[PDB]
Design an enzyme around this catalytic site. Structure first.
Site, PDB file in Angstrom:
ATOM      1  N   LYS A 107       1.026 112.393  21.158  1.00  0.00           N
ATOM      2  CA  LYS A 107       0.609 112.676  22.547  1.00  0.00           C
ATOM      3  C   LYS A 107      -0.897 112.835  22.778  1.00  0.00           C
ATOM      4  O   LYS A 107      -1.599 111.858  23.031  1.00  0.00           O
ATOM      5  CB  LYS A 107       1.354 113.927  23.041  1.00  0.00           C
TER       6      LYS A 107
ATOM      7  N   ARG B  84      17.281 105.471   7.061  1.00  0.00           N
ATOM      8  CA  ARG B  84      17.663 105.345   5.665  1.00  0.00           C
ATOM      9  C   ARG B  84      16.724 106.109   4.750  1.00  0.00           C
ATOM     10  O   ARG B  84      17.170 106.759   3.805  1.00  0.00           O
ATOM     11  CB  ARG B  84      17.742 103.863   5.190  1.00  0.00           C
TER      12      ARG B  84
HETATM   13  O1  LIG Z   1      11.682 102.025   4.591  1.00  0.00           O
HETATM   14  C1  LIG Z   1      12.823 101.753   4.945  1.00  0.00           C
HETATM   15  C2  LIG Z   1      13.468 102.488   6.132  1.00  0.00           C
HETATM   16  P1  LIG Z   1      13.567 101.572   7.689  1.00  0.00           P
HETATM   17  O2  LIG Z   1      12.168 101.789   8.457  1.00  0.00           O
HETATM   18  O3  LIG Z   1      14.718 102.005   8.513  1.00  0.00           O
HETATM   19  O4  LIG Z   1      13.644 100.010   7.307  1.00  0.00           O
HETATM   20  N1  LIG Z   1      13.607 100.866   4.341  1.00  0.00           N
HETATM   21  C3  LIG Z   1      13.213 100.087   3.152  1.00  0.00           C
HETATM   22  C4  LIG Z   1      12.577  98.741   3.503  1.00  0.00           C
HETATM   23  N2  LIG Z   1      11.119  98.887   3.393  1.00  0.00           N
HETATM   24  C5  LIG Z   1      10.232  98.364   4.237  1.00  0.00           C
HETATM   25  O5  LIG Z   1       9.026  98.609   4.174  1.00  0.00           O
HETATM   26  C6  LIG Z   1      10.792  97.536   5.394  1.00  0.00           C
HETATM   27  P2  LIG Z   1      10.963  98.594   6.850  1.00  0.00           P
HETATM   28  O6  LIG Z   1       9.627  98.352   7.716  1.00  0.00           O
HETATM   29  O7  LIG Z   1      12.199  98.321   7.617  1.00  0.00           O
HETATM   30  O8  LIG Z   1      10.896 100.109   6.306  1.00  0.00           O
END
Ligand SMILES: O=C(CP(=O)(O)O)NCCNC(=O)CP(=O)(O)O
Ligand SMILES: Nc1ccn([C@@H]2O[C@H](COP(=O)(O)OP(=O)(O)OP(=O)(O)O)[C@@H](O)[C@H]2O)c(=O)n1
Ligand SMILES: Nc1ccn([C@@H]2O[C@H](COP(=O)(O)OP(=O)(O)OP(=O)(O)O)[C@@H](O)[C@H]2O)c(=O)n1
Ligand SMILES: O=C(CP(=O)(O)O)NCCNC(=O)CP(=O)(O)O
Ligand SMILES: O=C(CP(=O)(O)O)NCCNC(=O)CP(=O)(O)O
Ligand SMILES: O=C(CP(=O)(O)O)NCCNC(=O)CP(=O)(O)O
Ligand SMILES: [Zn+2]
Ligand SMILES: [Zn+2]
Lengths: 152, 310, 310, 152, 310, 310
Positions: B84, B54
């Site tokens: 790595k 996202r």
């Molecule tokens: O940063 C994102 C992308 P994703 O790692 O897919 O949740 N979504 C917004 C929610 N923010 C958070 O810090 C929770 P997450 O650890 O899932 O990023």
């Protein structure tokens, strides 16, 4: 100089870190790699004091410390006195005071901090908390008691 | 140049209230009047050492909306230039000879700050560094609050869910604390309460906050109800069953709500916001995600374009 | 058109000294004066059947710097159109009806040459084919040597590390052997010595070369110290421990070095170059990686643009 | 190697390690945890001598070393003089002999040796060769040149 | 009590010629007169930290042939006794409170030796520790040599294949060198040569050895032709293909072999011994594997019983 | 027949103080006088739906020490009895037609109890069912307490570490609470506190318990210091680092310990008990694990034999 009842060690010029608590002198030499030089060095450990009972003493010839460098000694030997000696006499006398940053010698307690597997120097911002000292990692931005950071 | 020209965007704590306002004002301008060629000829690295679909799609879309080119990677299941053997420093030292800016998400705290020390004149934008910072999520959250409430001062903000481990609520709280008169309500299970350090930060600024067991106690006076995902994996299944009720929202819980109230959620929601909420005028988490494109565009423009002919 | 217009770039052995010079001269021109729209409207396939983040990002960035569009893939963990059931021939036969050029890296030797037989009028550029060729790494290495030493003839070149399996040192050696008066020093463990065939090739051209146990023997007369990664996985842990010392560099080993001397390493380094080397004026492996963008741009321009309005 | 200036006195009882090559004194204090004691200690680094240019000297009182422990300094200060004892006089002088075995202070170069992740003390069999010392690890049974084991 | 009673069996370097003879004399006696109840009521741990079906099946069969019970595991992808940080030391301190003897195979050199320091009164038998030792394979090899040749002295032993990395051939050479008048013939590609430390050891004892390019040069006089697998996994596919021919055995190569001559191979063979060799009277690799059972039974019986009424 | 003959052993809540005493009196008798043939001709299933090397090895050793045969499996990545939809119910209806008793560990709470509903005449022994029960670990813990202290009444028991999620400490607290005069000391980070339901249970029986920040506050009076592993996997790396110091034991902490005091830990320890504790006379975690064998033998003997001639 450490005078008792026979031979005593005084220096021409250089620096003399006095009144290091016991069991901290070897740590300073370690942490601050003081012996990685060709300059003459004189060290007395567990010396008798009275100003306490015991102490460590460090003498480095032809080597002087900035005020900032003296402050790095604050966490380990808060009550020490650093002497500037030139031509055989003490011209300077300073005490360490809390610096605003401690670089290179501490290790961040956060095991997931990027500082660990990498070519950077540790760095914490110093924050006296009227009871203990707070260290905030420049990298992971986490804050810890100096008591926890110094445990590692 | 503008105040953020060529600056690294690593932590909300390194951004002033004026910096935040400048990003938000720029976002509003780009939303109103698009500049599809602003970053024409810039090449940006989208480096997701930690996969995050996202956030990556959102950032990449923002890059394209300004006409910039994109190179990058994700899911560093290995990624020899990333985890790595090679240090992150060496990875950045190489990447910074190819691109104009680096957007990066990494699983370790401080990764983006470290990158900054090996990227030379190349700005790095932090898309997530462990449990530390996620500045652009906070910028899109602030932008969304400013847009729907008309300001960022004197608001009644409720935060619900995993206040303990949520890096997003930690920084939204710090960012709103740079403004005046905001009042906070913290609804969370004891096992997941807002950390003491954020609390200490607020007391020191003389900012009001209270703890509440459920949303209903406060629903009538909130302008923003910010929900967060309670990571099931952390809690014991039974523990989660016994506690989930107070941290989930249904449309029926909104009967009380002020007309202006908006419900935000950094996403994914699923276990905390019932789909019957989607149709209310309060649901604003998808409009919030859409605002990520305007906030990320503003940030890339300000950092890569000397002045902002806005 | 220019000599390389529409040509396949598969092996350093199919490139003349004049071809090499032409690529390098074009790279210098693009470095000095960028042409961000040169390949506008070209679509290039970045096909990494074998993942290689540093090389892929470098190539893709070069494509974008000339304004070309990019489609592609990596980590063929399967990639049904690539390894699964379908032949590489069929994969290329399809890919060549979509794009203007194909850049490909594959784990099997000869893959790029095979592609060439099914790509019709579509040029293929070899980004790595097993332990065989990697022509663009050699082009960026030559470019980096020419730029820092002022020429490619009469140099003292030392090569260190895994001279036995390093496809990169094999071809840099063959490429420098198309020029005159170069002298080679080969520092490597017996288990990983420069193969006999490269040696035979040099004797036949009457080119001087010697073997040395350590860098110090030669440090004072070298213009280029090219280091390579000794694949730990090949050697026995103990064997590697006993032999690593002579094939790793610290800044202290440079006291001796000529002022003009540059240290190169195709990367990743980590086990062979101490980070204290980074600050010396000799460290040139990151500038070398940066030159990959100019060498790859030159190559794509020459192959895809009829004349070179340079 | 006397000293016409202000050197180091020389207490009643203890041990004095003299003729320590330069940049080996501190190593000795760390490797052998010489300062983990309350007895008075006196150290001199980068001191001048009439046969080495520079030398390191260490004095630890009310502390004595067995021929085995003095042999353990063999790898670092092959030509040192450990001087011992009481009522202000050198009643004993010994040179480090190369031991048959060296424990605790070395690190096996083999990255796949089990010694590394485990609560065990390193252990090596010592074998003298023309031009160097062969050190064979107790655990992995691999033998290396001391130049490789001692390698930073 | 016999000399091996309650002794750890970790390295061939710790076993004297008399120890070897003792084990082999016991193996002959149990092969001729089985004692299916000798170890009844003993429980033995078969700990294969590193999986090895052939070796584990052999060792466990030997355990059952003496009447002992068995508990254990293989690979540690399927093990929670040292998965996220428990030391091998603690894993052994626990297991040794359960069983009467520990048989263990492990990926790190020194693992069996470390185990003895924590197993208390419980004997440890090394089933293979990284590239260090594999004493029971050597014991089974010696038993097979002794049984087919009637002696371990004054033999003509040729070793063929990967002599550089085969821990099995290093160990057998060390073992045979404890006996008198043996002469060695080493046939291997220059890249996989018997290591210099073994040659030095032979020199120091005045044992004759010599290198040969082909099996042909020594066939007429060889008593034991010991074939090893080539670790092609470290080699270049092309490199392997150029020399394999000189380390492969066909039945026709045996035309001038002595009547007593035996072909041994620790297995698996595959590309080194052609199936047409299997029918000749010289093929003895399957009989060699069957002998692992008597050598392994002897070892367990000697270590766990004070005096064997054999 | 004895009270436990043919009984299912699923939860400590189902065992009365007399049942506990019976098992422990039997364990002492078999530890002193082994019966290696007691269960000859019995076949027992060791069904580790969830892998657990330490527990499985212990339980299987106990089975063999009584002469029983064993069949079974571990993890179900390697199992086709309930892989693509076969219910646990059917898996048990089948296995119970094969064996004399079922020992099973499973990831879901209630699995051993469900198994009893389908195993007919075949007793089920719970080796761990998710975060619910692990009766034989408690039985081995109690046997160790009783053996070192001579009683299960009037003890000073401190529990340290992760008291929130340790099913092992919840169960031992429940078990000890069936005896009289016991007093508890709970030392744990606020985030991993002994749960309120256990405290309520203690309150309801008038059992004294109290919270303490450090081991120092209770050392002088503790009889059993029961250490648990911290599930850092649920914690924040930084969070863990801030409190770990208060739940780690060094030998120096034992200076004022009672002569009879014992340190127990279900294992693996790692960061909670320093190795210097191992040599003190208080370290009893390896003796504790060795006792799992006598507690587990007693259980099998009681359940499978009507009357034990012990
Ligand atoms: O940063 C994102 C992308 P994703 O790692 O897919 O949740 N979504 C917004 C929610 N923010 C958070 O810090 C929770 P997450 O650890 O899932 O990023
Ligand atoms: N040429 C000199 C002069 C002084 N010193 C050292 O300087 C230190 C401090 O001496 P000084 O400040 O002159 O008097 P003090 O009594 O030590 O002051 P204080 O009580 O604060 O320590 C002593 O350890 C002495 O050994 C030295 O090593 N060489
Ligand atoms: N009461 C004493 C006696 C000796 N020493 C030290 O122990 C060593 C003895 O040296 P010495 O007996 O005077 O003979 P050297 O001239 O030093 O010859 P060598 O060093 O080879 O013994 C010297 O470091 C001396 O300073 C000491 O600290 N205290
Ligand atoms: O080609 C690359 C990319 P990568 O496969 O990630 O090493 N780097 C330059 C080093 N060249 C080599 O041939 C070594 P490698 O096999 O790692 O490519
Ligand atoms: O090592 C083992 C166990 P396995 O993996 O079953 O061969 N047995 C002895 C064989 N010894 C060898 O040197 C042959 P290989 O290198 O295949 O282990
Ligand atoms: O759970 C088991 C099986 P194992 O995974 O081998 O420890 N044994 C009992 C240990 N009980 C505990 O509470 C410690 P842990 O949480 O590590 O299981
Ligand atoms: Zn940190
Ligand atoms: Zn070792």
């Amino acid at each position: 100089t450490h005078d008792n009842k026979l031979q005593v060690e005084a220096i021409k010029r250089g620096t003399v870190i006095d009144h290091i608590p016991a069991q901290i002198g070897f740590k300073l030499l370690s942490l601050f790699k003081l012996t990685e030089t060709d300059q003459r060095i004189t060290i007395g450990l567990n010396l008798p004091s009275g100003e306490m009972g015991r102490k460590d003493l460090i003498k480095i010839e032809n080597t002087f410390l900035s005020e900032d460098q003296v402050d790095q000694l604050a966490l380990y030997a808060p009550q020490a006195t650093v002497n500037r000696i030139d031509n055989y006499e003490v011209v300077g006398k300073s005490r360490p005071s809390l610096p605003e940053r401690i670089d290179n010698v501490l290790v961040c307690p956060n095991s997931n901090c990027i500082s660990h597997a990498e070519p950077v120097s540790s760095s914490f911002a110093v924050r006296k908390r009227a009871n203990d000292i707070a260290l905030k990692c420049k990298y992971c931005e986490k804050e810890f008691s100096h008591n926890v950071v110094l445990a590692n | 140049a503008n105040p953020l020209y060529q600056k690294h965007i690593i932590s909300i704590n390194d951004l002033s209230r004026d910096d935040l306002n400048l990003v938000l004002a720029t976002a509003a301008k780009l939303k109103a009047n698009p500049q599809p060629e602003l970053l024409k000829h810039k090449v940006i690295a989208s480096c997701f050492f930690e996969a995050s679909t996202r956030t990556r799609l959102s950032f990449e879309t923002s890059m394209h909306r300004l006409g910039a080119s994109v190179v990058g990677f994700s899911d560093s299941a290995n990624t020899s230039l990333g985890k790595k053997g090679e240090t992150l420093a060496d990875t950045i030292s190489v990447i910074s000879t190819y691109v104009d800016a680096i957007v990066m998400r990494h699983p370790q705290e401080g990764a983006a700050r470290l990158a900054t020390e090996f990227s030379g004149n190349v700005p790095v934008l932090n898309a997530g560094d462990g449990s530390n910072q996620h500045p652009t999520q906070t910028l899109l959250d602030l932008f969304t609050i400013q847009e729907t409430q008309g300001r960022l001062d004197n608001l009644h903000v409720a935060m619900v869910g995993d206040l303990k481990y949520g890096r997003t609520v930690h920084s939204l709280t710090q960012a709103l604390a740079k403004f005046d008169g905001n009042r906070f309500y913290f609804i969370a299970p004891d096992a997941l309460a807002m950390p003491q350090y954020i609390l200490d930060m607020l007391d020191e600024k003389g900012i009001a906050w209270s703890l509440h067991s459920s949303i209903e106690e406060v629903m009538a006076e909130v302008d923003i109800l910010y929900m967060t995902r309670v990571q099931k994996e952390r809690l014991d299944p039974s523990e989660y069953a016994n506690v989930k009720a107070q941290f989930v929202l249904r449309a029926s819980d909104l009967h009380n709500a002020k007309a202006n109230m908006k419900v935000l959620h950094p996403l994914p929601r699923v276990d905390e916001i019932a789909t019957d909420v989607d149709k209310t005028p309060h649901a604003w988490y998808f409009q919030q995600a859409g605002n990520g494109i305007f906030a990320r565009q503003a940030l890339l423009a300000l950092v890569l374009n000397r002045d902002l002919v806005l």
